[PDB]
Amino acid sequence: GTSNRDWWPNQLDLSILHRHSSLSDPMGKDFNYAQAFEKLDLAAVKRDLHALMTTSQDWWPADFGHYGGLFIRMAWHSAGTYRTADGRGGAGEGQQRFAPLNSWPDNANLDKARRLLWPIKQKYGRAISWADLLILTGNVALESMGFKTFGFAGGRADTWEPEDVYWGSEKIWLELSGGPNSRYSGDRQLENPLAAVQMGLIYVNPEGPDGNPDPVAAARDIRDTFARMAMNDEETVALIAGGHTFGKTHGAGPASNVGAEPEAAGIEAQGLGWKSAYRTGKGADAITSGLEVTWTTTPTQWSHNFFENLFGYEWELTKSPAGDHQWVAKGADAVIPDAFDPSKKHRPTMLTTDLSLRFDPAYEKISRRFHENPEQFADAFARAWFKLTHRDMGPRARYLGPEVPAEVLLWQDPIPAVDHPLIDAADAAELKAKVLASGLTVSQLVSTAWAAASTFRGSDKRGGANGARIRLAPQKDWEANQPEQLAAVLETLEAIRTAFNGAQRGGKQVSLADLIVLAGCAGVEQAAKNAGHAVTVPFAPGRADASQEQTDVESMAVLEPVADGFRNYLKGKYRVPAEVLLVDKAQLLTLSAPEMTVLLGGLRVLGANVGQSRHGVFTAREQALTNDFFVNLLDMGTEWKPTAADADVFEGRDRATGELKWTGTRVDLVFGSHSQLRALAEVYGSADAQEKFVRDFVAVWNKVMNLDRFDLA
Amino acid sequence: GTSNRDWWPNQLDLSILHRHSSLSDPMGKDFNYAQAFEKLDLAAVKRDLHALMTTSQDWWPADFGHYGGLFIRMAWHSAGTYRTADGRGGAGEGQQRFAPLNSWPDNANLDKARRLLWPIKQKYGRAISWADLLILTGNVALESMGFKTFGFAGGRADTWEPEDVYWGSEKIWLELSGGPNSRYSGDRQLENPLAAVQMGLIYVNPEGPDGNPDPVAAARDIRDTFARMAMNDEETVALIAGGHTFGKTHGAGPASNVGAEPEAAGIEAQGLGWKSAYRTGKGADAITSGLEVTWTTTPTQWSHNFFENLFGYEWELTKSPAGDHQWVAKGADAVIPDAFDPSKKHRPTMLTTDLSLRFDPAYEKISRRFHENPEQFADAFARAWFKLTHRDMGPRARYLGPEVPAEVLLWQDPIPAVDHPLIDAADAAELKAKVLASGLTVSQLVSTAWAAASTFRGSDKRGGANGARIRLAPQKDWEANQPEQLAAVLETLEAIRTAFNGAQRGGKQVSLADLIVLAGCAGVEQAAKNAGHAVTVPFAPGRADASQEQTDVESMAVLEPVADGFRNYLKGKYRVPAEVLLVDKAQLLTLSAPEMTVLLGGLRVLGANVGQSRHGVFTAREQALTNDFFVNLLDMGTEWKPTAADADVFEGRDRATGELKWTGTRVDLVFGSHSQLRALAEVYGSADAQEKFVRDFVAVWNKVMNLDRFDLA
């Protein structure tokens, strides 16, 4: 069937904003996963998982009699798709069970692992999500094998459809770099927001870059990809060596024996894939990656044998039975156990990427320290394993259950506890009036609260106005945030704050984070008053102020908005058209198309544009909350043409006289061009729509202000 | 960005079932368009529409000073996409304003027409939908030019994204037949469900079949496509001749002057397209189809001139200024007015397809009768214009406003009014006990009510259990309905009915339509009892019984289910895989994926399969309402393989012994294979789900039973 995407393959796609409807969700609209999970008997779940570890099924026999290595790999791949650039990927939505991830080559045979878990999932039902179960099972595998984990939090609710993620533009699985859709340019520069070297890999190629078995060059790719998953050198070494303490790779025969991935397989495969013609197709004959490496002498027990082997041998380049590059220990004895024949042993073996940990000079120093001090290795690995598996969960307020680590970690963007009474409705009224009486304008108030709140992304639940991190490095100096203007606003609000807090009794105080939001609420009310309309904007107190010492500045950099169409802002020129970037930002804000539309039309007339640009300010009553953006954009009396100077800036002239009325960007004008967005603009631009426009603007402003308010969840 | 569709282009698409969520809809979730429309000042709207007729805009100047012809074409194309096969297309959702229809070649410059209507749309806002406005406008155009219409109903609520329609598989606009994705095979047999000859045409090619200017062969295409739009010969002649009494075609210069269609146009085009480089690009210089034909001496007034011209001249094949085939009257004087120059006159001209109305022998007889009896022509055209424009609106109960024709028309599938007291809760309990005491089984009661109710399709709001048409030709003889079994159930129910009605006082009676539905309810209650569960199934009385004479047998044929996955039924072999057919049926039933899933799993265990097939009957307690379907489907103790005899029938064997446990079709097993479906099946197959499954089943069963209940709207 030919589709709109076939005919107009470059038209903007709004369907990413309308996923996750109540239509596709099998749970009722009142289901609350946290409420379910809080009553789960987590101990019982863990005892069933522990038993599973050594209960082999004949359709996918357990290596060494123990599924622990398979389950560790499963959980590491569940988490391992995460990119810090956008927050997308990660284990937090259980997306490994859907396309495309369920059928990535790097996820081969994890269909088997998830199938092994169906009995437990079935037993406990809605009280444990697949998302949570995949991570838990990796923890229980680690515990079963003698490794002490750092902890575990539940609360990842299941999803019901694939997420819309850009995983790259290649049309061939695993394509090597330098093709027509290459994700590399320049001197091996991986395109943002990608965090993997080839389409369908988690991070890097285990043979080496584009298959070249050089451990030093492989180290470069490990470092870059892991940094793009928010891990530093110590964490990276700890994770790789920790993982590879357990289990084995699978490459018993040629890869041409392996059939279709799950999304391509026949209906009778019942959701499994990679069926193999090689001998038994499983167990001793399994083929997963094509590599055939077993790292340690006790693949089912925590040890410090990975580093003992890595440093205790010299390594020779060899080939697996599938023809893939791997390494074997020179002159070694057969000391590694076979996975099924108790009378066979094997020489130590390594991947190219394992040897990176000894041949890259910076990794070698960490690896030596870990070899000499295995306690330090165990602690780093437990910490890194927790971070890997929790990095996309969001604020600690979302962590559920009895095994949550009490230690607050800097990567969590921690928010201090509130230990004092909160302002009430009358206090909030008093503060809104004090803010308006200070002389701060509607545009200042709206712009400041927008800047604070709109760092939130729903991909990994980072950002938002809680913390008042807008007053700290680096947010206070981001271009989009207009650093000098911002500092002036913040000084005025901090003086209101000090005067209000100094007058209270009883311990009551207001945080700066709450006052920033409240002040933006005052600005929105005042703009509505300026248009002739009395409205109250909802506000919920309870935000707290984080310190600079509780803020990792380097980690906060990925939250900078380099394109923010809601402020008509683009920090530089990108290949992706600005309208596409607006829909991307709206998805990370969790907005629907109607919410995006209302919000942007209102922001334009409120004065939220960076630099007070007139682009899209289609009103003669700026700082009044009216639907003038939509009425004026849709007026057929105005003709639009791209300027000579800049093809992405447009002049709006009266069609009869030629007189200049307005200017706009692509982000403004898309609302008059895209057929679905124009239809939305028409509802807000109609003569009956002033009340609707105000109410729906107030609703979406409050939604944005509350995106990180999981303390009210 | 490579997408799942790129990787697995033949995987089934469930997003068609979650279109039209509350996420994409800008109106609040309680907006009721009927209520808005009922308060519209329709007379005011009509006065504004009359004024617009002759208010020419310089960006698209009015032909003859009057936009009536353009607006009639606009309305006819809005309606013209309707296919009787699936009920899809038509005017009823205003889809001409969305892709792909806004950019079809046959809809060229209708973007202009719609833009002319924005000021009225803006003025009246939500109280008139685009969908209603496009039809009303065409009515006002006809009235303005002297033609009395048969009436008008409002109530077409707007939609907010494109509908998912199969329009064909060609990848080239306008592709002629016999290509790699030909919609024609055999002796000019158009593939169902298509109702147009080329991709991006409304019905037929105005030059003739594949561009060959043969009026006789064009007539054949006209007849077949119009019949696929529910129109017979008389209606077809009336509509073509009636339309072509007005306006003109546009082909002032070569088509190569015309630029990108709206979905391809630049952002500055602000939603318009087909900008032309020919001279002034508009008005006298307009290029729409490429043809240059003006049919009558008075193109802005109702006349009898069409048929005077068609019969009064002999016709010569010529070429328009764009090179396209058309006809000119031999030896005629220049009697047809020019659209813009009062000093220019033109000879009469005709399209190939207009000449079809004279050269096809059956159409000639109607055309002559219309030429000789103009009042017959006017009345037939009025009636046919009403049908055209209302054929997809559904039952009369949906018709709104002061201009609704009182006359009941056969094509409306009329349902008599209820003129007696209805059964109450005590009566419903008494009837359900009678039904259960008769010996009708769960399987029979469920199957019969399913058969009755599941004829409904939301595309054109035809079908459903109201009317008790299951007892009439042709429904009573459809194979999917199990005609012998059906007859036996109906006889039993009709005797219950007679006995109950004969005992009443006052006028109270129960219709057979109600009793069939109530009896299906009793069957579901009984199946719950058989599973150990108390359950209450909602029922709403008020259905009435239509007569055979109120049921057009040939129009009913398109409602026959040739594939009904819910009954594991496929009447023959189709090219489209059966699980795609199931999702298509779910879309017509208005079901989401979770409702399709629950419903099918329940139906399997209740005995609703045609012929009592065991395919999918994954329970040892048939006729008990349980979640067994899901629990057994998902049991990894079972291995599935296609049979030798039939690749579309699968055997489920115990994995350890080989013993046969079940058999299933593709429609059964897709719930275990498709990653999104399987995720849904897992929720219902979990150990905590029996109660959820029963309550969700009852809800969706009730939903189906009430799909056509617009008397309760």
Ligand code: HEM
């Ligand atoms: C440079 C980064 C990494 C590379 C290239 C990589 C590569 C792979 C490969 C190719 C396999 C074999 C798949 C098979 O044939 O069955 C695998 C297995 C495995 N990996 Fe990694 N790995 C990386 C990091 C990790 C990390 C971070 C962890 C966890 C902390 C992990 C844990 C495992 C485990 C436990 C197995 C064994 C699976 C089994 O016993 O079935 N790996 N690795």
Ligand code: HEM
């Ligand atoms: C065999 C079926 C039909 C064919 C092939 C056909 C073809 C066309 C074509 C090619 C045009 C010219 C487009 C342009 O260049 O502007 C057109 C114009 C138009 N048609 Fe038809 N037509 C059909 C039936 C209809 C019907 C059923 C109606 C309405 C009842 C209708 C009403 C009109 C009107 C009013 C115009 C004039 C538009 C204007 O003045 O701008 N036609 N027709």
Ligand SMILES: [Cl-]
């Ligand atoms: Cl994601």
Ligand SMILES: [Cl-]
């Ligand atoms: Cl449709």
Ligand code: NA
């Ligand atoms: Na994420």
Ligand code: NA
């Ligand atoms: Na329809």
